């Protein structure tokens, strides 16, 4: 119907006029103010610049690193390119988190060890229906994926608090693919007010005090 369609159009432009207006008026981003998004492709990225600045404004190195590599998530980088990233320069005395799909689970292990980490813990993430997950597992159906955690250096220091978090996590798969919120909480237990990094990062997952690099930011 011409009249209805004509109707929606004007109703619609108004929202834009409204929104573009609020934005003019300082309407906030969803993103917390303290987050430090950066848009690049890691392959392209020179990490020297990131290191120089971080050393410069913190005189420190990252307490934590996270990862959801896009294995052949799903931005299809060469497996070697991910492996060959210079993560070792990025942090000297800290933890690392990395999400391994069941396909890459072993390879991931080999990867953190290569970068000098010692595997100490694995987080498990279940997808409760709200209560169980249906995954087309090759041998066994999968009802979780899992974060592999590695460490280097002294964590005997005050900043990291031992026994502060849990291996299992319980959340719904919001905004799939989206990692559970509560990981950032759990990272608060481990580190409180610590300089964090994240790689391959989605827009949705930015948080305060967290550097973030992804090509969709």
């Amino acid at each position: 119907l011409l009249q209805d369609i004509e109707k929606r159009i004007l109703h619609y432009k108004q929202l834009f006029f409204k929104e573009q207006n609020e934005i003019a008026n300082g309407k906030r981003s969803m993103v917390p103010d303290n987050s430090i998004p950066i848009c690049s492709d890691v392959t392209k990225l020179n990490f020297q610049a990131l290191i120089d600045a971080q050393m410069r404004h913190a005189g420190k190195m990252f307490d934590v690193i996270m990862m959801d590599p896009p294995w052949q998530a799903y931005d299809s980088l060469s497996d070697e390119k991910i492996q060959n990233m210079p993560i070792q320069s990025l942090q000297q005395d800290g933890f690392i988190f990395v999400w391994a799909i069941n396909a890459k689970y072993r390879v991931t292990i080999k990867m953190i060890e290569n970068w000098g980490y010692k595997l100490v813990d694995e987080i498990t993430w279940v997808k409760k229906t709200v209560k169980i997950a249906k995954g087309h597992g090759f041998y066994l159906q999968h009802a979780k994926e899992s974060c592999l955690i590695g460490v280097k250096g002294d964590v005997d220091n005050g900043r990291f608090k031992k026994n502060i978090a849990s291996d299992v996590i319980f959340s719904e798969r919001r905004g799939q693919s989206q990692k559970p919120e509560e990981i950032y909480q759990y990272i608060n237990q481990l580190c409180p007010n610590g300089n964090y990094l994240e790689i391959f990062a989605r827009r949705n997952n930015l948080h305060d005090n967290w550097v973030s690099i992804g090509n969709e930011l």
């Binding site: 006029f17 934005i23 981003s29 993103v31 103010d33 430090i36 950066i38 848009c39 404004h57 007010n193």
Partner: protein, 129 residues
């Protein structure tokens, strides 16, 4: 005993793309409400305004090549132009090339009239059909 907020700025200055953060180094929420890759930069806003002056309203195909190389949603243009002139029906102005000096007037004029008529919503005058 670290100010994260300050730390964010200097990093954001040398690390983050020009659109992402302001010159002071604060982060500009405009970029983050718009979908990525669809951001409308101040500088290419000037270009829309410039384009109307050269080619005229509703000249988007001709206007598009000159100022937005790919570039941008043909709809976004017309929607943005509705904003420049302060009306919500841009039909009246079509095919007319309007100087920046005059876009300012039309917008100024259209808004005042809308405010008296009490048919101004969101700083845009609503037009009867």
């Amino acid at each position: 005993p670290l100010d994260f907020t300050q730390y964010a700025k200097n990093m954001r200055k040398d690390l983050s793309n020009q659109d992402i953060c302001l010159e002071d180094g604060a982060l500009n929420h405009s970029y983050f409400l718009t979908k990525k890759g669809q951001y409308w930069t101040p500088l290419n806003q000037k270009a829309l305004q410039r384009g109307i002056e050269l080619f005229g309203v509703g000249n988007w195909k001709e206007i598009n090549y000159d100022e937005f190389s790919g570039k941008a949603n043909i709809v976004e243009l017309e929607l943005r132009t509705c904003m420049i002139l302060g009306i919500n029906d841009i039909t009246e102005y079509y095919g007319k090339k309007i100087s920046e000096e005059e876009q300012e007037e039309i917008k100024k004029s259209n808004i005042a009239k809308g405010k008296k008529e009490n048919k101004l919503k969101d700083n845009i005058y609503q037009k009867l059909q």
